Amino acid sequence: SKINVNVENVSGVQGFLFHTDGKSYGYRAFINGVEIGIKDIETVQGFQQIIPSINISKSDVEAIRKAMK
Amino acid sequence: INVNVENVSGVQGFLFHTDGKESYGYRAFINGVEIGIKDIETVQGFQQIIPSINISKSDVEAIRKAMK
Amino acid sequence: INVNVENVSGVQGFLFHTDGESYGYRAFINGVEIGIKDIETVQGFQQIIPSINISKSDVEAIRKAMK
Amino acid sequence: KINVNVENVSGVQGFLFHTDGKESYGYRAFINGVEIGIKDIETVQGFQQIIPSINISKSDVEAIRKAMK
Amino acid sequence: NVENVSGVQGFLFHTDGKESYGYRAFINGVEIGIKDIETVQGFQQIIPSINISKSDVEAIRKAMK
Amino acid sequence: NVENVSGVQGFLFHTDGKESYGYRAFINGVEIGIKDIETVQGFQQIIPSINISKSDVEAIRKAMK
Amino acid sequence: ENVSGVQGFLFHTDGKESYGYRAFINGVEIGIKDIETVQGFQQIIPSINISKSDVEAIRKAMK
Amino acid sequence: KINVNVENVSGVQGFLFHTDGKESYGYRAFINGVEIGIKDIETVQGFQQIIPSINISKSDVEAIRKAMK
Amino acid sequence: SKKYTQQQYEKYLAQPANNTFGLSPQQVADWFMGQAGARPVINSYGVNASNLVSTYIPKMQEYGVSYTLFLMYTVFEGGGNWINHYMYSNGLECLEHDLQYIHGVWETYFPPALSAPECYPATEDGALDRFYQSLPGRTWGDVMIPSTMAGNAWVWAYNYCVNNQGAAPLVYFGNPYDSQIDSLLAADPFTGGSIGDGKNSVGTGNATVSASSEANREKLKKALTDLFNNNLEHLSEFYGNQVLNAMKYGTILKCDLTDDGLNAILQLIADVNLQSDRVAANLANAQAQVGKYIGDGQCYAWVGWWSARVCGYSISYSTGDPMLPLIGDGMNAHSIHLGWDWSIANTGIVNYPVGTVGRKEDLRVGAIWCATAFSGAPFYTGQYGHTGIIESWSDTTVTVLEQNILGSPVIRSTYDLNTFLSTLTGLITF
């Protein structure tokens, strides 16, 4: 009737990549409840394949830190 | 027809806004913590990982007690 | 088509009302019973949690099971 | 872009039970390990949308109680 | 906890051979004997109904405990 | 089929070679010997049936314990 | 927590020095002697290629 | 309405990481929260079938270690 | 069990359907609600009881199927629509397909039951095959007899069943004819016949060689991988990329995934993804092969020979010719579009699920056409459908070149355009 496809994750990584397009703290990411700063674009492109890349303004970053801790 | 995937984001919650006369803007619950969104960029960004639902200003007080 | 994400809303429960005396729209959100005042909140929550029908007489019994 | 939920997220684990035989106990249920009695048909039709409705004979009800608790 | 929607984990078991114990089931690690066919048909909608010979029943009890 | 509702974790094992031990199974970390073909056909509906040689059986026991 | 109750993989090498077919079943390393057991387990767990030199490193991670 | 579940039976949670820049550390991987170094291409090709292979620059490796621990 | 006499069973099956027993209005609808029985058909595909059934019954009357006998059979088993088979939008639509199936069975001949899955053939007390052939056309027996295996075994081979019984290798089943007659009386189906029918086809099709089956799960993975790969425009998205690249770590472990069950899933996936210079040179060479046996002598061989002459690859191993990559089914001629994979050379598509449609515009000479499991109207197919090539057509009639029609060879046959398109399940254009 209506087939369901249940997919299981394999990466063992829970989090997201965050940046701004305005006027910037560069590319930063939360990996398994730990905040880390990305230095190169290669790591950004690599992690984008496993975790989502979202946009967070510099003003809102402080509020996200409290919730992700 | 439908496919089911895992929450690889480590974020559990939702975004909430009003379309009525009196508005509190955009606010969201991130891992049981209530936070206020200031810019539209953060709204559009979070909408990709967590759902954006409509909650009236009058009902906000009741949701706070349940989400705590 | 229609890709769904598992355990994202962080909300476990349902919306309940009667079509018969009416108490209005009420909901159980993460084991906590709450009363909905506006139709906008009902339509919003219907997108994340299911909306079921419970008669006024049976409401008392559901409270004991959901606690 | 809207991030659709499955639902699947009712937070209710159990089933509705009744008998079509001679002696009837009406419609009864098990909601999160708690046994309950249903008075109106509206609640039956409502709960049928989230939990399954199965047939249990009056004689077998006693045995199911021990397993469900 | 944190599985399916019926809140029932198990199966229905019977034998079609010579010498029958009727219909029996394992519900949440607890072995129960079914008395009526209505309960069998009802439970078949939520849990699977499999065939187990009378001789093998003893071995399944030790594994399901 | 719904196999997650069965409450049974394991597999059926047999050999097609010269020396045979018949049909045996691992049910919830417990090794059990199947006597009748009815139990084999019944369990095949809930748990998978795989091929293990008599020589390798000893090694699988240590891992499944 | 999973159906079949087996978590692991089958591993072997196509290079010069071979250790045959070996497998990790529920965090326990076991050595396969016959090809019947290999073909049987391939139906439930995946069969991957690991070089003899790298086997030592995988043991520490799988423990 | 039947359901087809694609679940991870491999018992391995992680990813393969390497750099394409000037200074290279070769192929390395994170298997079940344990960091391991791959010596041969055969192991890389084998693991690529069960776990994803992503790009991480040498400069960013230090930050990933803290988050994966 | 055998609660009735041999004469009574014969009289019950001799009943035309047709015959509603004079219980056509409310009385049969009121019984359907209480006997439940019909509980899964009442809940799923929601119908508004007696009043909605009074809108459902004329559809059965339009298809010339007994209102009483259809509702009784719906109570006999349920579910998984209405009777047997797998899936199909609505209850009224779901009912029409079931009636369309009976049309492709009540006139088509199928060899009688006497048990086949799980050993031991039932020793008869010859008369069953004589009785099935004795029955003329659109009778209740012509619908029941080929479908119900357990019924025929307890009526025509009762002596064997009582002496045995019996678990998995022997007789485990009961008598569905007893259960049907007991519930039908709860109308007189024996006395009605004696105090119908007196009226006027034989089945077509076979199955290809098929090296099947070792791993069905491998076919299920590709079908889902290609489904998302073809629908990559919606993802291109973080969650969408995770759904597209979901197939890497295995395995989709399904114990009950049978050959019939896999095909149903594979055809469900197909109906979602779906919605001349090369032919012209070999066409002159193919027309000379008419009247001659090309296979094998089967429908797949003539299709295989024609495809190998145009594209390069064949279907039947006897044509041989290199084989096409088998991605599904396989065994049946419904369909070859639907397995084989013609992306390797050139494909048409035009997959027609359950009901209907036909599509006269999607012809294109000379495409490989597939016919439904049970036609019945032009070819009278059974289990595995029919296949051939289109030669020419008019807005009235269609000329086709096909092989195994009641024993081959390659014959040029003209059929009604509307009647032929009704039989169609899919086309493959070059």
Side-chain angles (χ1 to χ4, degrees), chain E residues 51, chain F residues 12 23 34 36-45 49:
Chain E
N51 291 68
Chain F
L12 282 140
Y23 270 94
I34 323 294
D36 285 285
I37 210 87
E38 191 191 2
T39 315
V40 176
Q41 288 182 270
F43 268 97
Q44 269 171 356
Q45 293 232 103
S49 184

Side-chain angles (χ1 to χ4, degrees), chain G residues 7-8 13-14 48-49 51 54, chain H residues 9-11 40 42-43 46:
Chain G
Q7 279 201 54
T13 189
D14 294 322
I48 66 152
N49 290 68
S51 62
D54 286 300
Chain H
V9 298
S10 67
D40 286 75
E42 190 187 22
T43 317

Side-chain angles (χ1 to χ4, degrees), chain H residues 18-21 24-30 32-33:
Chain H
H18 70 291
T19 195
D20 295 324
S24 188
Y25 56 87
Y27 270 94
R28 288 193 68 88
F30 273 111
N32 297 56

Side-chain angles (χ1 to χ4, degrees), chain E residues 16-17 20-34 36-46:
Chain E
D16 296 319
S20 184
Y21 55 87
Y23 268 94
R24 288 193 68 89
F26 271 106
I27 294 154
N28 299 302
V30 185
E31 199 191 324
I32 264 114
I34 321 296
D36 239 280
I37 210 87
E38 194 192 9
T39 316
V40 176
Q41 288 182 271
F43 268 96
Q44 269 171 356
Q45 293 231 101
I46 56 145

